[PDB]
Amino acid sequence: ASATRVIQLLRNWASGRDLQAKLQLRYQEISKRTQPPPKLPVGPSHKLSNNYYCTR
Amino acid sequence: ELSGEMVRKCDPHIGLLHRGTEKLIEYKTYLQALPYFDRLDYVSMMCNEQAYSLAVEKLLNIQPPPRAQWIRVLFGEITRLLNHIMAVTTHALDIGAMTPFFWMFEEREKMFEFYERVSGARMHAAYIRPGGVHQDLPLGLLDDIYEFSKNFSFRIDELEEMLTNNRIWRNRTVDIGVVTAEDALNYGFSGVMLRGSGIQWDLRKTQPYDVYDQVEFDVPIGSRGDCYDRYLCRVEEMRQSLRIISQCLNKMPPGEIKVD
Amino acid sequence: TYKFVNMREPSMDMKSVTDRAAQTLLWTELVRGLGMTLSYLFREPATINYPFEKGPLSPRFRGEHALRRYPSGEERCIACKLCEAVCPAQAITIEAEPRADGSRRTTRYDIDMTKCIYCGFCQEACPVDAIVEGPNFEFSTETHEELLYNKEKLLNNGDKWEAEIAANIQADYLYR
Amino acid sequence: MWFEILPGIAVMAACLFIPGMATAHIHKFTNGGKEKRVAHFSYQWNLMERDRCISGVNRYHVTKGLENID
Amino acid sequence: MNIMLTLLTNVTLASLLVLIAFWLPQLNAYSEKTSPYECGFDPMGSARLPFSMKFFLVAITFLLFDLEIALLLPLPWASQTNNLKTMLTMALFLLILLAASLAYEWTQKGLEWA
Amino acid sequence: MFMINILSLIIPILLAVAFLTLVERKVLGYMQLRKGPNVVGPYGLLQPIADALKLFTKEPLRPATSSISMFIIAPILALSLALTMWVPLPMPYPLINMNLGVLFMLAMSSLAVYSILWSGWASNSKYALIGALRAVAQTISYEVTLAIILLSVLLMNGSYTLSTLITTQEHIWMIFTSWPLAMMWFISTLAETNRAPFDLTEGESELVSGFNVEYAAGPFAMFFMAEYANIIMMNAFTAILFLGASHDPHTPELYTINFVLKTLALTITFLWIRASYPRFRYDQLMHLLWKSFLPLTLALCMWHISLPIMTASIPPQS
Amino acid sequence: SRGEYVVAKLDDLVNWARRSSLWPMTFGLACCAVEMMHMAAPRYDMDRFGVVFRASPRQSDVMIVAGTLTNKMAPALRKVYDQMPEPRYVVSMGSCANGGGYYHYSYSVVRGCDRIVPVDIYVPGCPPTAEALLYGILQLQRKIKREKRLRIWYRR
Amino acid sequence: MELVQVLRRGLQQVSGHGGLRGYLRVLFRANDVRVGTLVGEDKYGNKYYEDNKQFFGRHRWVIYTTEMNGRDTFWDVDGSMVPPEWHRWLHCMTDDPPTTKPPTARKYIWTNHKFNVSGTPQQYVPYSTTRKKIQEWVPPSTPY
Ligand code: SF4
Ligand code: SF4
Ligand code: SF4
Given ligand 3 and candidates G27, G29, G32, G102, which is best to mutate, with the most ligand atoms within 8 Å of its CB? Answer: G32
Query: Do the strands G89-93 and G62-66 form a parallel or antiparallel pair, or are they unpaired?
Result: parallel
- Which amino acid, E84? L
Return contacts of B91-95, CB within 8 angstroms, 24+ apart. B91/B231, B92/B163, B92/B169, B92/F278, B93/F205, B94/F205, B94/F206, B95/B169, B95/B172, B95/B173, B95/F205, B95/F278, B95/F279
Q: What distance, in Å, lies between the first and last C-alpha atoms of chain A?
A: 56
- Which amino acid, F275? A
Which chain A residues have a beta carbon less than 8 Å from that of C46? 24-25
- Collapsing DSSP to helix, strand or coil, C154 comes out as helix
- DSSP assignment of G5-30: HHHHHHHHHHHHHHHHS--BB--B-S
> Quick one: residue B158, left, alpha or beta (phi over 0 = left, psi -120 to 50 = alpha)?
alpha
**CB G40, CB G53: distance < 8 Å:** yes
- Would you give the DSSP letter of residue G113? G
> What chains are in contact with D, requiring at least 3 Cβ pairs below 8 Å?
C, F
- Collapsing DSSP to helix, strand or coil, H87 comes out as helix
CA distance, residue H58 to nearest chain A CA (Å): 10
Report the structure determination method. cryo-EM
- CA-CA-CA-CA dihedral for F26, F27, F31, F33, to nearest 10: 10
> Quick one: residue B129, left, alpha or beta (phi over 0 = left, psi -120 to 50 = alpha)?
beta
Which chain D residues have a beta carbon less than 8 Å from that of F253? 21, 24
Residues ≥6 apart with Cβ < 8 Å to F155: E75, E76, E79, F304, F305, F308, F315
Domains, in order of start, for chain E: 1-108 (1.20.58.1610)
Phi, psi of C69 (to 5 degrees): -125, 160
- Would you give the DSSP letter of residue B138? P
**CB C150, CB H127: distance < 8 Å:** yes
E strands present in chain C = 2-4, 65-67, 92-98, 104-112, 131-133, 148-149
CA distance H70 to H115: 11
Phi, psi of B181 (to 5 degrees): -60, -45
- CA-CA-CA-CA dihedral for F282, F286, F292, F297, to nearest 10: 130
CA distance B93 to A1: 29
CA distance, residue E87 to nearest chain B CA (Å): 41
E strands present in chain H = 37-41, 47-50, 60-63
Residues ≥6 apart with Cβ < 8 Å to F137: E55, F200, F282, F285, F286
Given ligand 2 and candidates C82, C121, C126, which is best to mutate, with the most ligand atoms within 8 Å of its CB? Answer: C121
CA distance H120 to H78: 14
- DSSP assignment of H55-76: PTTSSEEEE--SBSSS-B-SS-
CA distance G110 to D66: 95
F181 closest CA partner among F143, F154, F141, F199: F154
CA distance C88 to C79: 18
Q: Whose CA is nearest to atom 4 of ligand 2?
A: C116
CA distance B32 to B38: 12
B221 closest CA partner among B193, B242, B188: B193
**Side-chain-side CA neighbours of residue C86 (13 Å):** 16
Whether B162 and F276 lie within 8 Å, measured CB to CB: yes
CA distance, residue E76 to nearest chain F CA (Å): 5
Whether F38 and H28 lie within 8 Å, measured CB to CB: no
G71 closest CA partner among G112, G31, G127: G112
Q: Roughly what angle, to the nearest 10 degrees, separates helices H19-30 and H2-16?
A: 90
Which chain G residues have a beta carbon less than 8 Å from that of C54? 131
- Which amino acid, F318? S
Residues ≥6 apart with Cβ < 8 Å to G30: B17, B39, B42, G66, G67, G68, G94, G96
G54 closest CA partner among D4, F112, F217: F217
Instruction: Report, in this order, helix, strand and coil percent for chain A, each rounded to 5.
Output: 25, 0, 75
CA distance G148 to A14: 51
Measured between CB atoms, does G38 come within 8 Å of chain B?
yes
CA distance F55 to F41: 18
G97 closest CA partner among G136, G126, G139: G126
F13 closest CA partner among E3, E21, D12: D12
C78 lines ligand 1 (CB under 6 A): yes
- Would you give the DSSP letter of residue D30? T
Query: Residue C158 CA: which ligand is closest?
Result: 1
CA distance F12 to E108: 51
**CB H91, CB C135: distance < 8 Å:** yes
Which chain G residues have a beta carbon less than 8 Å from that of B33? none
Measured between CB atoms, does F275 come within 8 Å of chain E?
no
**CB E41, CB G80: distance < 8 Å:** no
CA distance C83 to B124: 19
C160 closest CA partner among H68, G123, H85: H85
Q: Is G113 part of any known ligand binding site?
A: no
CA distance F257 to F245: 9
C45 closest CA partner among E69, F90, D5: D5
- Which amino acid, B217? F
PDB resolution in Å: 2.9
Beta carbons within 10 angstroms of residue H53's beta carbon: 13
CA distance H114 to H120: 12
CA distance, residue C35 to nearest chain H CA (Å): 23
Residues ≥6 apart with Cβ < 8 Å to H73: H64, H65, H66, H67, H81
**What is the chain B residue with the closest CA to E114?**
B6
- Residue C12, CA distances (Å) to B167, B170, C9 in order: 20, 21, 9
CA distance A36 to B252: 20
- Collapsing DSSP to helix, strand or coil, G90 comes out as strand
Show binding-site residues of C for [4Fe-4S] cluster: 65, 77, 80, 83, 87, 109, 116, 119, 121-122, 126, 133
- Would you give the DSSP letter of residue G59? G
Beta carbons within 10 angstroms of residue F263's beta carbon: 26
- Collapsing DSSP to helix, strand or coil, C69 comes out as strand
> What chains are in contact with F, requiring at least 3 Cβ pairs below 8 Å?
B, C, D, E, G, H
Q: Roughly what angle, to the nearest 10 degrees, separates helices F217-242 and F101-123?
A: 150
CA distance F57 to F71: 19
- CA-CA-CA-CA dihedral for C113, C115, C117, C122, to nearest 10: -70
Which atom of ligand 3 has the smallest separation from the CA of G32? 4
Return contacts of B109-112, CB within 8 angstroms, 24+ apart. B109/G38, B109/G41, B109/G43, B110/A26, B110/B148, B111/B78, B111/B81, B111/B82, B111/B148, B112/B82, B112/G38
Query: Do the strands C104-112 and C92-98 form a parallel or antiparallel pair, or are they unpaired?
Result: antiparallel
Given ligand 3 and candidates G91, G93, G96, which is best to mutate, with the most ligand atoms within 8 Å of its CB? Answer: G96
C62 closest CA partner among C143, C131, C153, C108: C131
- C123 CB burial (10 A radius; 0-12, 13-18, 19+): buried
CA distance D35 to D33: 7
In chain F, positions 187-246, which contact chain E (CB-CB < 8 Å)? 208, 213-214, 217-219, 221-222
C111 lines ligand 1 (CB under 6 A): no
Instruction: Note if the bond before G85 is cis, omega within 30 degrees.
Output: no
According to the 3-state scheme, what is the secondary structure of chain F? CHHHHHHHHHHHHHHHHHHHHHHHHHHHHHHCCCCCCCCCCHHHCCHHHHHHHHHHHCCCCCCCCCCHHHHHHHHHHHHHHHHHCCCCCCECECCCCCCCHHHHHHHHHHHHHHHHHHHHHHHCCHHHHHHHHHHHHHHHHHHHHHHHHHHHHHCCCCCCCCCHHHHHCCCCCCHHHHHHHHHHHHHHHHHHCCCCCCCCCCCCCCCCCHHHHHCCHHHHHHHHHHHHHHHHHHHHHHHHHHCCCCCECCEHHHHHHHHHHHHHHHHHHHHHHHCCCCCCCHHHHHHHHHHHHHHHHHHHHHHHHHHHHHHCCCCCCC
C77 lines ligand 1 (CB under 6 A): yes
A38 closest CA partner among B70, C166, B144, C173: C173
Residue of H31, H34, H76 best to disrupt the F interface, most CBs of F under 10 A: H31
- Collapsing DSSP to helix, strand or coil, G99 comes out as helix
E strands present in H5-139 = 37-41, 47-50, 60-63
| C-alpha D69, offset from chain centre | 28
The CA-based angle B94-B99-B105, given to 5 degrees, is 90
